[PDB]
């Protein structure tokens, strides 16, 4: 049986990046040239793996993360990157082994009247650790005065709304992004190719 990549790539809903979704891929064969031979991806770069040599290789655990970010934030979805997304929403380890896939989704994630359901974490007291998913809503203290869990000046709700109006610039338009993680452990392989 073939790996259910369509469940995440062809999903109707995607998650906000702060609450990014994770789907583990196991006990199946995965044809990656099917994905590599699609012209419908703005970005698809791989790290620590050759995308061509991926159909003849096995891995212990394969994960598929999916979320929505701006076009100009797709650069942040890479090992060692810096910024609001990479540091506060979705961080990849330095030794990341996998592929980052993204495509424009302005047609689906920005309708007449915009779309303010996609959120991202604008503030955090410290950077995320890799593969951490912070969904807390503690009021962030931006200035000197303490907040005490109430919103006010310099005391912000940590999650901020993406604009995502239909006639935004290409870099402020929503992009759907799937990250494939190829973890290799001294353990049985659960995902291979032909």
């Amino acid at each position, epitope marked *: 049986n073939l790996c259910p990549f369509g469940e995440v790539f062809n999903a109707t809903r995607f998650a906000s990046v702060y609450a990014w979704n*994770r789907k583990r891929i196991s006990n199946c064969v995965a044809d990656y040239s099917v994905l590599y031979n699609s012209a419908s991806f703005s970005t698809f770069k791989c790290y620590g793996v050759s995308p061509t040599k991926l159909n003849d290789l096995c891995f212990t655990n394969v994960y598929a993360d999916s979320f929505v970010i701006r076009g100009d934030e797709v650069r942040q979805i890479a090992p060692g990157q810096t910024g609001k997304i990479a540091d506060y929403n979705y961080k990849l*380890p330095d030794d990341f082994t996998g592929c980052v896939i993204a495509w424009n989704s302005n047609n689906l994630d920005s309708k007449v009247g915009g779309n303010y359901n996609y959120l991202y974490r604008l503030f955090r007291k410290s950077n995320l*650790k890799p593969f951490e998913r912070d969904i807390s809503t503690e009021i962030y203290q931006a200035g000197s005065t303490p907040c005490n869990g109430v919103e006010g000046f310099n005391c912000y709700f940590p999650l901020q709304s993406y604009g995502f109006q239909p006639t935004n610039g290409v870099g402020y338009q929503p992009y759907r992004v799937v990250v494939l993680s190829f973890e290799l452990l001294h353990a049985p392989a659960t995902v291979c190719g032909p």
Partner: antibody, heavy 127, light 111 residues
């Protein structure tokens, strides 16, 4: 299978230095925190410190800050705990334990607490 | 910063009864970042509860954790022979900076 293994029992003299190790397998060692817990004979658990092996972000309890040193070697998936000058009052069982952060989502769901423990390293410091 | 106080210190019960274990905090663990462990003689502790109310994988349903704020409770409804051991509560509210255990509570088979 996730497994944390600790080094063997240690019998030392006061003033001697000591380093004990904790090696993890069956999971991404750099993605989970590793805590160190002390249990003196017939007593309860005491948190000593914690380290994230991905970047060696190390956090100590104020009762053990400067008392001891916690480190890690990613290349051998090992966390360390070491004293520069052991003392008789350091005679105890020393547990290393894996602790996923309350935010860690690497499994597809959230976890918490010291979920996996080593078998402990017995350290006896006597004259 | 936060002190954890468990009650009672030691308790004797037969199997089939219910054990109600209390864990007090000097401040409010407002994150519910509290865990429960079980330790048997000559054995490492074992995680039972995390997040104050969520059972770890494999833990039977007779173990139930509850509480918020400053009082937290571990309730073991139908005691079995293997349940009589020492139990600890952990707080990790200011992650990752501070962890604190309680002194423990020992369960003792009645006879």
């Amino acid at each position: 299978q996730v497994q944390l293994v600790q080094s063997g029992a240690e019998v030392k003299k006061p003033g001697e230095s000591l380093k004990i190790s904790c090696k993890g397998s069956g999971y991404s060692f750099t993605s989970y925190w590793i805590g160190w817990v002390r249990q003196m004979p017939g007593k309860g658990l005491e948190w000593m410190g914690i380290i994230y092996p991905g970047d060696s972000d190390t956090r100590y309890s104020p009762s053990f800050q400067g008392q001891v040193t916690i480190s890690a070697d990613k290349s051998i998936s090992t966390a360390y705990l070491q004293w520069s000058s052991l003392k008789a009052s350091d005679t105890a069982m020393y547990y290393c334990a894996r602790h996923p952060s309350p935010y860690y989502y690497g499994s597809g769901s959230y976890s918490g607490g010291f979920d996996y423990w080593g078998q402990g390293t017995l350290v006896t410091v006597s004259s | 910063d936060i002190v954890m106080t468990q009650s009672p210190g030691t308790l004797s019960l037969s199997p089939g009864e219910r054990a109600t274990l209390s864990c007090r905090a000097s401040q409010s663990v407002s994150s519910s970042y509290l865990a429960w462990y079980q330790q048997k003689p000559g054995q490492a502790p074992r995680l039972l509860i995390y997040g104050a109310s969520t059972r770890a994988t494999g833990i039977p349903a007779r173990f139930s954790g509850s509480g918020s704020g400053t009082e937290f409770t571990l309730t073991i409804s139908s005691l079995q022979s293997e349940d009589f051991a020492v139990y600890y509560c952990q707080q990790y509210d200011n992650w990752p900076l501070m962890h604190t255990f309680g002194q423990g509570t020992k369960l003792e088979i009645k006879r």
